[PDB]
Amino acid sequence: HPKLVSSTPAEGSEGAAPAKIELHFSENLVTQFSGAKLVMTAMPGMEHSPMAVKAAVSGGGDPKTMVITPASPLTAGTYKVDWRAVSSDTHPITGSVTFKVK
């Protein structure tokens, strides 16, 4: 089964707004069954409130890499990437990556 090897930004990281989010998995993904959603869970001065972020999701050049690209630059707040990794003849695997933008 594919598991999340690494990502940019990394889990728990705090830093600048990423132009795109990259997820690297241990196994090659089937593009049509794999995917992800980006959510803002919080922003400065306001209560926690999950909201889908307008973003596109595609495989990279590497079949083990998933790329999420926001429609517009991410503003300050906490974000989570809920991903769905499906390799060939394998049960779907899901997970969540969280990170903060300042």
Tokens of 70: 């926001």
48 is in an annotated binding site: yes
**How far, in Å, CA of 40 to CA of 4, rounded?**
21
The answer to whether 99 and 10 have CB atoms below 8 angstroms apart is: yes
Nearest Cα neighbor of 99 from 76, 80, 84, 73 is 80
Return left, alpha or beta for 19; rule: phi > 0 is left, psi -120 to 50 is alpha, else beta.
alpha
Q: Which is nearer to Cu ion, 10 or 51 (CB)?
A: 51
Q: How far is the CB of 46 from Cu ion (least distance, A)?
A: 4
Q: How far is the CB of 61 from Cu ion (least distance, A)?
A: 27
66 is in an annotated binding site: no
Q: Which is nearer to Cu ion, 30 or 43 (CB)?
A: 43
Region near Cu ion per CB under 5 A, out of 7-15, 18-26, 58-66, 85-93: 85-93
Q: Which is nearer to Cu ion, 36 or 40 (CB)?
A: 40
What residues numbered 17-56 form the site for Cu ion, per CB under 5 A? Answer: 40, 43, 46, 51
24 is in an annotated binding site: no
Tokens of 40: 């803002």
Radius of gyration, CA atoms only, the chain: 13
Footprint of Cu ion (CB under 5 A)? 40, 43, 46, 51, 91
